[PDB]
Design a protein around this ligand. Structure first.
Ligand SMILES: Nc1ncnc2c1ncn2[C@@H]1O[C@H](COP(=O)(O)OP(=O)(O)OP(=O)(O)O)[C@@H](O)[C@H]1O
Ligand SMILES: [Mg+2]
Ligand SMILES: [Mg+2]
Length: 356
């Protein structure tokens, strides 16, 4: 049992994803993504050990035949996924980086003397870190896992294998109140001009929280407009909208296609429809009613209707979202919305481990 991510943080939170180079994990087909985790000796979960990119079917090297069944097993790259922590918690950020670098050195020894064997649950030499194995039905192998012996690889990490995910209070997006919020608001798809635009459209309206409504409107409208732009650009089938009806040839497999996710740069990871909950029933109605013409003044009726309905019925920006994250008082929790930095920017590089 790999522990689930904590969902609540007092303020902004950060998680990291780190794909390793130099080895693979092989596991039975249709196995769970998580096969273990690393915790501090104190018991705090630091990161998960996961399979990531499928690298083809696993073939046990004949020189390592052990009478064991490896039928239908698949090879994957290994990705280290941190348990989120508070963005300003220096010790927690540092312990995650150090534990990942330690595990990479441990993997370097593992492929040298225990190639094509599962990782064992052990404690680090200095006693700082502990490996827990949740799926023993795995093997770790050097390189691409075809040869019985390694090429003496050092297990490494690189910016191209790294992402960071930032979680903030949903009510904060558009307020520019913190450096994290300002970094998120710098996303090219976010149109800050929409805040003042909403205020102009709703003067005769007596809104419960006009500034919160304007922020929600700018956030949702920016996402809806960007989705329509990407659907047109990449020829994506959204709801009932057919790109071929507008003479657009598909050039992506959908919203989850890595090139589509890369085009967001700062990728929303939370279901857009969740944000409506931060407003009163009345204010939410006013925000939603005003989004439709923003799409319709820029996109065809069919694309506008389909994007609007898609997000209204709880559609996700790019597959399964992180929709249960909260911020503030643990007792009266507030919605947190998450964002994935496809490439780690200079502002967040200090959160990522660097191979020495
Ligand atoms: N509350 C949180 N605050 C900040 N980061 C978080 C939070 N919860 C999870 N994360 C981070 O989110 C990332 C994992 O996202 P997720 O669990 O959705 O994976 P995934 O489903 O495989 O991703 P994807 O849908 O992009 O393929 C990690 O970096 C993790 O630390
Ligand atoms: Mg991941
Ligand atoms: Mg990622």
């Amino acid at each position: 049992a790999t522990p689930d991510f904590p969902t609540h943080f007092p303020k902004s939170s950060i998680g990291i994803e780190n794909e390793l180079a130099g080895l693979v994990v092989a596991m039975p087909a249709n196995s769970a993504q998580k096969f273990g985790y690393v915790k501090s000796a104190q018991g705090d979960a630091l990161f998960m050990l996961t399979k990531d990119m499928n690298q083809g079917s696993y073939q046990r090297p004949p020189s390592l035949q052990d009478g064991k069944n490896y039928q239908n097993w698949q090879t994957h790259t290994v990705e280290l996924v941190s348990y989120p922590c508070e963005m300003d918690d220096k010790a927690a950020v540092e312990t995650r980086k150090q534990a990942m670098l330690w595990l990479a050195t441990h993997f370097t020894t593992h492929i040298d003397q225990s190639n094509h064997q599962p990782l064992a649950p052990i404690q680090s030499e200095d006693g700082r870190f502990v490996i827990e194995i949740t799926n023993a039905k795995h093997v770790i192998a050097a390189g691409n896992g075809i040869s019985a012996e390694s090429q003496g690889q050092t297990i490494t990490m690189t910016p191209s294998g790294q992402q960071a995910t930032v979680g903030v209070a949903a009510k904060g997006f558009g307020t520019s109140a913190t450096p994290e919020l300002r970094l998120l608001e710098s996303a090219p798809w976010y149109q800050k001009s929409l805040k003042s635009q909403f205020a102009s459209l709703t003067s005769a309206e007596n809104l419960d929280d006009k500034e919160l409504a304007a922020n929600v409107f700018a956030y949702l409208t920016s996402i809806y407009l960007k989705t329509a732009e990407l659907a047109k650009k990449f020829g994506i089938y959204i709801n009932e909208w057919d790109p071929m009806s507008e003479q657009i040839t598909p050039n992506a497999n959908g919203l989850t296609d890595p090139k589509v996710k890369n085009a967001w740069e700062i990728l929303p990871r939370t279901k857009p429809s969740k944000i409506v909950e931060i407003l009163s029933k009345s204010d939410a109605k006013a925000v939603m009613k005003h989004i439709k013409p923003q799409l319709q003044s820029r996109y065809s009726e069919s694309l506008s209707k389909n994007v609007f309905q898609y997000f209204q019925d709880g559609g996700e920006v790019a597959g399964h979202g992180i929709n249960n994250a909260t911020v503030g008082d643990k007792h009266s929790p507030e919605l947190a919305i998450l964002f994935e930095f496809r490439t780690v920017p200079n502002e967040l590089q200090s959160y990522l481990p660097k191979t020495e």
